[PDB]
Design a protein around this ligand. Structure first.
Ligand SMILES: CCCCCCCC(=O)N[C@@H](CO[C@H]1O[C@H](CO)[C@H](O)[C@H](O)[C@H]1O)[C@H](O)[C@H](O)CCCC(=O)NCCCCCCCCc1ccccc1
Ligand SMILES: *[C@@H]1O[C@H](CO[C@@H]2O[C@@H](C)[C@@H](O)[C@@H](O)[C@@H]2O)[C@@H](O[C@@H]2O[C@H](CO)[C@@H](O)[C@H](O)[C@H]2NC(C)=O)[C@H](O)[C@H]1NC(C)=O
Ligand SMILES: *[C@@H]1O[C@H](CO)[C@@H](O[C@@H]2O[C@H](CO)[C@@H](O)[C@H](O)[C@H]2NC(C)=O)[C@H](O)[C@H]1NC(C)=O
Ligand SMILES: CCCCCCCCCCCCCCCC(=O)O
Ligand SMILES: *[C@@H]1O[C@H](CO)[C@@H](O)[C@H](O)[C@H]1NC(C)=O
Ligand code: NA
Lengths: 200, 239, 264, 98
C-alpha cells in the first residue's frame, strides 16, 4: 500500500465541515485525484491536483496538494446528507497513458441529517392485495433515536428520505410478522420518544 | 467520454465460465480492468493498448482478457471461484493520463445454486391516520424470501422512476439468521403528498430486479427455475 | 569552444532484463559516469560538481534517479503498446547537452537500434527525417506528458548552459593542460612513426627528407590512452635501401617551438 | 549489425625488459554487448582494466581495454574479441612496433 487515507471513517452532523487526508509514497507523483463513490454506485471525480503546491475548489469541496510532503487534504464545507459516501484518493505516476493509478482504500463519511420538526408516530399499513397482511411504520423521529432488532418478528434499521421539492427530511423504520403482533408492541425493544403518536 | 459495462450484476457458480464485457465508443486505444474489494483500493487485473493486445496488470491470476476490437474489452473468468466475488470496473482513455470509468459490475460466485430464489413483493398502502396527521402518505414495499441478496429495488410512478421521497434499507436482513443460506428480506419507503396519493390516476409500482440463474444454468429441482427476473407490486391512488 | 555530451545507452534484452549506463564528456575529458549498478552518478574529476552547491547537485541527481527508473518502465511499456511491430532486443541511445560559444545551443537526440530517429525541439518531441511512421504513436504519448516537457525545456535551455559555465571555470587547469608527445620509429616497406602521450588533440606529423614534406604520409586515427592523452601513428611506403635521410617531424602546442625530429 | 575494428598499441615506446602499458581499442560495433580479452602467449591476462563504454557521433560504440605488461623477445600479446556480428572470435596480435 503506497496510498494511505485517514480517517478510516468518520460520522459528522449535517452542516459541519470535515477534512480528509491522503498520504502517499508513490514515485513519481504526477497528479492526485479525489473520487466520491456512493454506496453501490461508481466513481465521480471531484478534483485533480497537478502542481508542486496546488489548491483546487469545486463548490463545497476544496483541496490541497503538497508534493514535497506527499500529502493531500480534501475539505468539505457545510456537509449535506448526499455527502454520505466513500472518498477515494488516487495518485497517477505519469502525465500520460504510460501511467499507473495507485488507489487508496478510501475514507467512509456518514452525514447525520438535521430533522427540523419531529413528529414521532407509529402507523399501520395494509397490503393493497391481501388486506389481512400488514406492516408497522415508525416514522418522523429525530436523529438521536436508535432502532433495535423475537426472531419471528422483523424490524429494519432506520433510513432517511428526502422529499426534495418540499425541502423536508424524515427517518423511518418498518416492522412486520405473521406470528399477537400489533403495531403498539412492535417497537417495545427500542428507546422511543415519550410523545410518540399511536393512533386509532 | 462514456464507458458501459455488462452485465451490471451476476450470480455464478464455482467452476463456471463468466465473461464481463466493457463497451466504449470514444475511439480510445486503451482499456483497463480493475476489481474493488473492501479494505483495498482498486487493483489492476489486465489492460490493453488496442485491438489484439492484452497485458497482465498487478493481479491477473484467474483471469483471461480479450480485446477483439477498439470498442470492446472483456474479462473472462474460465473457472470461477468464490475469491472472484467482487465489484469490477472497466475504464478507457487516450494518450493522456485520465481514465474514464464504467459504472461497475457486481459478481457473486456461490459454491452452489440450490438455494437461489426470487423475491415475493408486496406493496403496503398509506395509513389513513398518517395522511390526517401529516398531510403526507408513505407507501412501503416489502421484498421477501429471496436468495442471494443481489437485488435492485426501484419505485415507478406512471411509468417513470422516482428518487425524491424514497429510501431503501442499505442492506437486506436475514429471515432466519441462524441458518447458513438464510433467505433475505428488504424494505423501502416512498413518501408523497396526501393530495398526490388521493389522485386515482397516479399509478404506483414497487419493482425488484432479482439476479439469479441464466437460461443456460442447469436446474435439477421440482420448483420453477429461479432465473434473473423482475417481480413487482402495484397500486392506484384513491380519493 | 567546448561541447558537453551526456551519452546514455540502454539495452533491453527481453520484458524483464534491461540496463542503462551513461558517461559524460566535456570536450574529450570524461566528467561523470553512471553505471547501471550504482544508485548514484559518479564524479570522474574533482571539479565534476562544477559551481553547483551540494544541495543543487542532490536535487539534480534525484531527478535523474527518478528518470532512470521511469525511463526504463516507459520503454517496456511502449514495447507492449507497439507489439508486434517492434520487439526485443532493443537498444536506445540518448545524446544530450549543450555546445558553448562566447557571450550556447542545446540538443537531445535519440537513436533506436543505432539510428537517429527522435529529438527534443522547442517544446516537444519530434521524429526526424527518415524515421519510420509507427513512431508517431510513441511521440504522441510522450508529448502528452506536460510535466516532462517543462522539465526537459528547463534542462536544455537553462540548467545545461549554466552548469557547463561552472564546469569550464572549475576545470580550467585540466582542460588547458599541456602533455608532451613522445615518438618512436619502426618498419615492416612501410615505415611507422608512432606519437604518444600528447594533449590536447591538435597535432601535426609528417615524414621528411631534410626540409621537404613527404606527401605520401598517411596519418592514422586518434586513439586514446588510459590517462586521457592521445596516440597517433603516421605511415609511409618506400623502397628498401631508400630509408636513409628520412625523418618523422612532430609539431604540438606542448613543445613550444622545439619540434621533435627522429632520423631513421 | 557491424564488425568491430581492433587496434593494439603501447602507451610508451617498447623496450624489452621495461614495464609498459598495452592498449586494445575496440570500435565501430553495434549492438554494445561485447567480450574483450587481452592475451599473453594465448593465455588470459588476469587484471585487465577497461574504460566505460561510450559511443561516437555515428552511434557506434567503442571501449578501451588496457593492462600492465613488460615486452620481451619471446612473448606474444594479443586482443581477442567475441561479438554477435562475427561467427568466431577475431584476434589481433601486437605487432612489436606499436
Ligand atoms: C535526458 C532527458 C531527461 C528527462 C527527464 C524528464 C523528467 C522525467 O523523469 N520524466 C519521466 C517521469 O515522468 C513523471 O514524473 C515527473 C515528475 O518527476 C513528472 O510529473 C512527469 O509529468 C511524470 O510523467 C517520464 O516517465 C519520461 O517519459 C521518462 C523518459 C523520457 C525520455 O528519455 N524520452 C526520450 C525517449 C524517446 C524514445 C522515443 C521512442 C523510441 C523507442 C521506442 C518506441 C516504441 C517501442 C520501442 C522503442
Ligand atoms: C526553451 O527554448 C525553446 C526554443 O529553443 C530551441 O529548442 C530548445 C529545446 C533547444 O534545443 C535550443 O537549442 C533551441 O534553440 C523554446 O521554444 C519556443 O517556445 C514557444 C512557446 O513557448 C514556441 O512558440 C516556439 O515556436 C518555440 N521554439 C521552437 C524553435 O520550436 C521554449 O519555449 C523554451 N522554454 C523555456 C521554458 O525556456
Ligand atoms: C539495472 O538496474 C536496475 C535498477 O537498479 C535493476 O533492476 C532491479 O533488479 C532487481 C533484481 O532483479 C529487482 O528485484 C528490482 O525490482 C529492480 N529494481 C528496480 C528499481 O526496478 C536491474 O536488474 C539492473 N540490470 C542489470 C542487468 O543488472
Ligand atoms: C541532459 C542534458 C542536460 C544536463 C544538464 C545537467 C548535467 C549534469 C551532468 C550530470 C548528469 C549526468 C546524467 C546524465 C543523464 C542521463 O542519464 O542521460
Ligand atoms: C532475458 O535476457 C537475459 C540476458 O540476455 C537472459 O539471460 C534471460 O534468460 C532472458 N529471459 C527470458 C528470455 O525470459
Ligand atoms: Na510507464
Amino acid at each position: 500500500t503506497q496510498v494511505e487515507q485517514s480517517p478510516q471513517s468518520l460520522v459528522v452532523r449535517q452542516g459541519e465541515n470535515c477534512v480528509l487526508q491522503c498520504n502517499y509514497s508513490v514515485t513519481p507523483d504526477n497528479h492526485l485525484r479525489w473520487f466520491k463513490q456512493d454506496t453501490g454506485k461508481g466513481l465521480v471525480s471531484l478534483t485533480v491536483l497537478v502542481d508542486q503546491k496546488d489548491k483546487t475548489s469545486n463548490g463545497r469541496y476544496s483541496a490541497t496538494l503538497d508534493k514535497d510532503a506527499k500529502h493531500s487534504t480534501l475539505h468539505i464545507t457545510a456537509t449535506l446528507l448526499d455527502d454520505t459516501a466513500t472518498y477515494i484518493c488516487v495518485v497517477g505516476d505519469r502525465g500520460s497513458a504510460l501511467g499507473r493509478l495507485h488507489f487508496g482504500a478510501g475514507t467512509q463519511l456518514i452525514v447525520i441529517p438535521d430533522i427540523q420538526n419531529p413528529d414521532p408516530a407509529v402507523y399501520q399499513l395494509r397490503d393493497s392485495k391481501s388486506s389481512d397482511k400488514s406492516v408497522c411504520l415508525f416514522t418522523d423521529f429525530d436523529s438521536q433515536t436508535n432502532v433495535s432488532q423475537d426472531s419471528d418478528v422483523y424490524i429494519t434499521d432506520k433510513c432517511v428520505l428526502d422529499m426534495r421539492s418540499m425541502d423536508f427530511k424524515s427517518n423511518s423504520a418498518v416492522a412486520w410478522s405473521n406470528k399477537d403482533f400489533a403495531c403498539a408492541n412492535a417497537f417495545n425493544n427500542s428507546i422511543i420518544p415519550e410523545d410518540t403518536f399511536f393512533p386509532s | 467520454a462514456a464507458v458501459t459495462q455488462s452485465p451490471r450484476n451476476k450470480v455464478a457458480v464455482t467452476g463456471g465460465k463468466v465473461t464481463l464485457s466493457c463497451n466504449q465508443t470514444n475511439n480510445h486505444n486503451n482499456m483497463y480492468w480493475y476489481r474493488q474489494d473492501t479494505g483495498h483500493g482498486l487493483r489492476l487485473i489486465h489492460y490493453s493498448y488496442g485491438a489484439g493486445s492484452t497485458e497482465k496488470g498487478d493481479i491477473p491470476d484467474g483471469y483471461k482478457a480479450s480485446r477483439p476490437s477498439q470498442e470492446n474489452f472483456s474479462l473472462i473468468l474460465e473457472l470461477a471461484t468464490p475469491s472472484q466475488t467482487s465489484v469490477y470496473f472497466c475504464a478507457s482513455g487516450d494518450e493522456g493520463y485520465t481514465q474514464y470509468f464504467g459504472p461497475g459490475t457486481r459478481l457473486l460466485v456461490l459454491e452452489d445454486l440450490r438455494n437461489v430464489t426470487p423475491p415475493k413483493v408486496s406493496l403496503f398502502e398509506p395509513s389513513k391516520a398518517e395522511i390526517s396527521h401529516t398531510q403526507k402518505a408513505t407507501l412501503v414495499c416489502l421484498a421477501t424470501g429471496f436468495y442471494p441478496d443481489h437485488v435492485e429495488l426501484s419505485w415507478w410512478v406512471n411509468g417513470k422512476e422516482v428518487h425524491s421521497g424514497v429510501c431503501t434499507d442499505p442492506q437486506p436482513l436475514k429471515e432466519q439468521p441462524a441458518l447458513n443460506d438464510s433467505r433475505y428480506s428488504l424494505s423501502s419507503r416512498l413518501r408523497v403528498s396526501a393530495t398526490f396519493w388521493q389522485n386515482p390516476r397516479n399509478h404506483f409500482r414497487c419493482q425488484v430486479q432479482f439476479y439469479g440463474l441464466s437460461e443456460n444454468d442447469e436446474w435439477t429441482q421440482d420448483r420453477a427455475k429461479p432465473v434473473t427476473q423482475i417481480v413487482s407490486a402495484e397500486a392506484w391512488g384513491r380519493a | 569552444n567546448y561541447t558537453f555530451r551526456c551519452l546514455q545507452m540502454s539495452s533491453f534484452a527481453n520484458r524483464s532484463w534491461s540496463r542503462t549506463d551513461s558517461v559524460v564528456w566535456l570536450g574529450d575529458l570524461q566528467t561523470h559516469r553512471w553505471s547501471n549498478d550504482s544508485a548514484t552518478i559518479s564524479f570522474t574529476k574533482p571539479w565534476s560538481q562544477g559551481k553547483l552547491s551540494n544541495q543543487q547537485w542532490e536535487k539534480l541527481q534525484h531527478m535523474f534517479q527518478v528518470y532512470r527508473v521511469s525511463f526504463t518502465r516507459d520503454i517496456q511499456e511502449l514495447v507492449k503498446m507497439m507489439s508486434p511491430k517492434e520487439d526485443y532486443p532493443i537498444e536506445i541511445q540518448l545524446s544530450a547537452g549543450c555546445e558553448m560559444y562566447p557571450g550556447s545551443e542545446s540538443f537531445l537526440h535519440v537513436a533506436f537500434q543505432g539510428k537517429y530517429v527522435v529529438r527534443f525541439w522547442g517544446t516537444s518531441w519530434q521524429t526526424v527525417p527518415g524515421a519510420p511512421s509507427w513512431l508517431d504513436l510513441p511521440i504522441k504519448v510522450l508529448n502528452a506528458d506536460q510535466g516532462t516537457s517543462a522539465t526537459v525545456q528547463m534542462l536544455l535551455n537553462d540548467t545545461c548552459p549554466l552548469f557547463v559555465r561552472g564546469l569550464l571555470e572549475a576545470g580550467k587547469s585540466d582542460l588547458e593542460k599541456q602533455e608532451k608527445p613522445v615518438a618512436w620509429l619502426s618498419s615492416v616497406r612501410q615505415l611507422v612513426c608512432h606519437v604518444s602521450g600528447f594533449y590536447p588533440k591538435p597535432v601535426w606529423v609528417m615524414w621528411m627528407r631534410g626540409d621537404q614534406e613527404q606527401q605520401g604520409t598517411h596519418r592514422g586515427d586518434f586513439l586514446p590512452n588510459a590517462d586521457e592523452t592521445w596516440y597517433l601513428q603516421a605511415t609511409l611506403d618506400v623502397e628498401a635501401g631508400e630509408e636513409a635521410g628520412l625523418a618523422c617531424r612532430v609539431k604540438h602546442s606542448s613543445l613550444g617551438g622545439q619540434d621533435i625530429i627522429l632520423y631513421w | 549489425q557491424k564488425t568491430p575494428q581492433i587496434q593494439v598499441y603501447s602507451r610508451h615506446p617498447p623496450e624489452n625488459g621495461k614495464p609498459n602499458i598495452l592498449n586494445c581499442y575496440v570500435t565501430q560495433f553495434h549492438p554494445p554487448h561485447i567480450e574483450i580479452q587481452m592475451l599473453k602467449n594465448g593465455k588470459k591476462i588476469p587484471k585487465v582494466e577497461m574504460s566505460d563504454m561510450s559511443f561516437s557521433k555515428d552511434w557506434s560504440f567503442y571501449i578501451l581495454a588496457h593492462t600492465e605488461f613488460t615486452p620481451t623477445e619471446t612473448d606474444t600479446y594479443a586482443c581477442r574479441v567475441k561479438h554477435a556480428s562475427m561467427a568466431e572470435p577475431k584476434t589481433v596480435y601486437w605487432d612489436r612496433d606499436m
